[PDB]
Design an enzyme around this catalytic site. Sequence first.
Site, PDB file in Angstrom:
ATOM      1  N   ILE A 111       9.009   9.929  -8.186  1.00  0.00           N
ATOM      2  CA  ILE A 111       8.512  10.669  -9.344  1.00  0.00           C
ATOM      3  C   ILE A 111       7.237  11.420  -8.936  1.00  0.00           C
ATOM      4  CG2 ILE A 111       7.760  10.444 -11.767  1.00  0.00           C
ATOM      5  CD1 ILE A 111       9.431   7.579 -11.312  1.00  0.00           C
ATOM      6  N   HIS A 112       7.455  12.564  -8.290  1.00  0.00           N
ATOM      7  CA  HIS A 112       6.392  13.431  -7.793  1.00  0.00           C
ATOM      8  C   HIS A 112       6.716  14.925  -7.936  1.00  0.00           C
ATOM      9  CE1 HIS A 112       4.058  10.190  -6.226  1.00  0.00           C
ATOM     10  NE2 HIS A 112       4.917   9.855  -5.280  1.00  0.00           N
ATOM     11  N   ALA A 113       5.772  15.747  -7.491  1.00  0.00           N
ATOM     12  CA  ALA A 113       5.904  17.196  -7.519  1.00  0.00           C
ATOM     13  C   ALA A 113       6.547  17.730  -8.778  1.00  0.00           C
ATOM     14  CB  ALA A 113       6.681  17.670  -6.306  1.00  0.00           C
ATOM     15  N   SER A 157      11.435  11.831  -3.049  1.00  0.00           N
ATOM     16  CA  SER A 157      10.057  12.122  -3.353  1.00  0.00           C
ATOM     17  C   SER A 157       9.618  11.193  -4.462  1.00  0.00           C
ATOM     18  CB  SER A 157       9.940  13.572  -3.788  1.00  0.00           C
ATOM     19  OG  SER A 157      10.656  14.407  -2.893  1.00  0.00           O
TER      20      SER A 157
END
Lengths: 87, 87, 332, 332
Positions: A13-15, A11
């Site tokens: 550097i997300h959520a 993912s």
Amino acid sequence: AQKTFTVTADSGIHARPATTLVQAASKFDSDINLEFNGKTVNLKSIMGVMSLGIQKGATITISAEGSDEADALAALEDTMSKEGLGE
Amino acid sequence: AQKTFTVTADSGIHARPATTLVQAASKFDSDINLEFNGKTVNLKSIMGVMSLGIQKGATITISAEGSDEADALAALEDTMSKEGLGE
Amino acid sequence: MNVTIYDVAREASVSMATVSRVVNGNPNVKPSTRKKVLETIERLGYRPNAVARGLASKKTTTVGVIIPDISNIFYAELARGIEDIATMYKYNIILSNSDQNQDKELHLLNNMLGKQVDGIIFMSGNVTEEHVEELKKSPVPVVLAASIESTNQIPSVTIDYEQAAFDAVQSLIDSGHKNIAFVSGTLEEPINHAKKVKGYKRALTESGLPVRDSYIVEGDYTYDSGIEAVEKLLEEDEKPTAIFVGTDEMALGVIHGAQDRGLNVPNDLEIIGFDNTRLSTMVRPQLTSVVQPMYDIGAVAMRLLTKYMNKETVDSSIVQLPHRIEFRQSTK
Amino acid sequence: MNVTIYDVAREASVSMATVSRVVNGNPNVKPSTRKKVLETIERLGYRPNAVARGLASKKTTTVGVIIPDISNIFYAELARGIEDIATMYKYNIILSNSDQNQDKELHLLNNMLGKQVDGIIFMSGNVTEEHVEELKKSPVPVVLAASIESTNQIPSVTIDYEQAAFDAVQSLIDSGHKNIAFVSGTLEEPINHAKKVKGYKRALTESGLPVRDSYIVEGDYTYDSGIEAVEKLLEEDEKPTAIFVGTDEMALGVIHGAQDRGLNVPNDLEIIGFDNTRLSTMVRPQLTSVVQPMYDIGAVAMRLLTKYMNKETVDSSIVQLPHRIEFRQSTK
DNA sequence: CTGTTAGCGCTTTCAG
DNA sequence: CTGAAAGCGCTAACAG
């Protein structure tokens, strides 16, 4: 003060990973900013970080600078590792 | 006063469909009742209808008893099919 | 429990203007006298009342959020996105499902403002002209998250469903595709009509392949609309060489119905999706998709609302967020 | 400014108590006045602030609801059935994710409580001992949803996990299965060790078809874990002709798993999941999964709680909503 | 630093 | 039926 990792999580550097990282880096007085592909942003801001669009395999550089600067690094390195986004 | 329907909707009398049948019978003063498999429940209680577990294919009897019975029955007919649960 | 602030003012033997301070880490209060009071506080069982304060200070530290449906993965992730951030900023949120229907959105928006919120995160698929008349009257900050806004008059947060449309299809043009179809959702929806088809279209005219109006087969966003959209597109005529789908759950149907007639997805027909939801890996030949970070939208949305609520002039009330393509194996 | 109770008092020329009684729609206030007031009211555009009224009445008309993850399919549906009914009952719902982890659940409780909720729908995957302690000492009602705790000290809604599982295994046993394994969620969580494995086990020792602790492989609840739990189990001497997955997503990872290995799910090895989220349909061999009424848990979890807040009492604080299976293609 | 004085905007016993 | 004070618990100017 500085360290370079490579996000290897799918993912990037997300959520949560990114909030738990900022958060993790929002508990330090020393300054801290994440740079990548030319842009550099406050690693203490959720609007900044999720702007970069950092995908997997991307390479990033975390730079801390302040009285906590030292630990500032160990802390985010761990969270990068234990949150398994960057190693 | 009443009618017998063949619940034909895949989820039967559950979820959003169901939560409506239980709303529509609450808009009318009359006493509404639903029997299924020999047990009866207030067509106005979400905790009662939802706890029977009417599957597709079951046969249920919606019954109205009071001043507006008709408005309601004529009402739990439209809903029934507008929500496609019975015939 | 009922041991009010006054009850404590006794144990600590200080005023209430003072416990009021300890409770909120106020501007100066002796370390010995503060941990003196905070000391007899826990002794009891006093629990500050958030309603008494709301009243006395005209702020609740709670935002109101109105999404169509927290039951659909899209919004739920988006919702998760918001919550984590409101919490990160010590905010409680009030959630309400509107179901895209015009009245509830306004009712809610009323009950909301009536319930004394500190900001509103609104999200819908069709932000009517009235909504803006409506939403612009509110007495507190308001931001849209992945919500279709026109006049860019009220702060929003999103990704160019238009570019993402173009970029996605282009990928397909670059590989040798002249017959590329397009499946989509309800046509009466901005994201679709407004930006989705726009992107798709210009993509072709930009390459010189005007497109068959029929090649825009649509349907309700389920896996049902998939085997549906396929069967129709295929047999119909020309039997396109590649498809593009407006979401992931549909793209799946697109893929099985294509395997049902007999084609080979990775090869014969290359499909590609939008959103890239969990399910994008939960399919036969994993679906290449156009990344839409619903969690960052919500995360960001809430964050913007955070500045406004704290009065900082963080301009650019119109925020765009990087979308991207992820080709797993679907597209050669 | 924004508008007050006293305002309507002038425009209606009545007493603030009169205005209060109509807004509240309490019994008896002559149709002559109840009418006059209501006009002064919607024409003046009054909206009473729920905060001011909360303080006055000790009631906020809003419930807290701790929840593990709203982003997750299972709880997203659960949270809709709740909201759905909380709206039906004129109730607003505050909400924060707990992440199944013991400390947050306890911080949310006081933030919620001090915010002054009127009820608390608590739901976790592992009720602790200190858990029932602070819950029993809460000022407002409470009920657990899609969650279970031993002593039965707290009102609650849920399914018979032991039977739910035992019937699944049974569906297989009777069919010609001697080797059936169990891929499951975190064994350290009661939903697994307490009722899932028990159900599975007994089902075997029932037909006298004994169990190798090996066959009980543990994954997280991820699609991948499902791909990992199959490859491990196929790396066994005497492979299982059937498996029982504690989730549908997990089960989706077990199905594709075997396929990417060389077995075609229906024949080589039948697969039966649990929950029956939409996903079951989105898979190659449509996935046969035990059914759990997610919407019904919350629907019911919330409605029940309305009884306790609304002082009425009805007996059945421990409701077990029925279950059943849905045999798709995945198995006989 | 810390008190003191007022309400924030509703709802309620009671009264008549 | 419909007024009339009496505040729910807090915080917020402003003293001291």
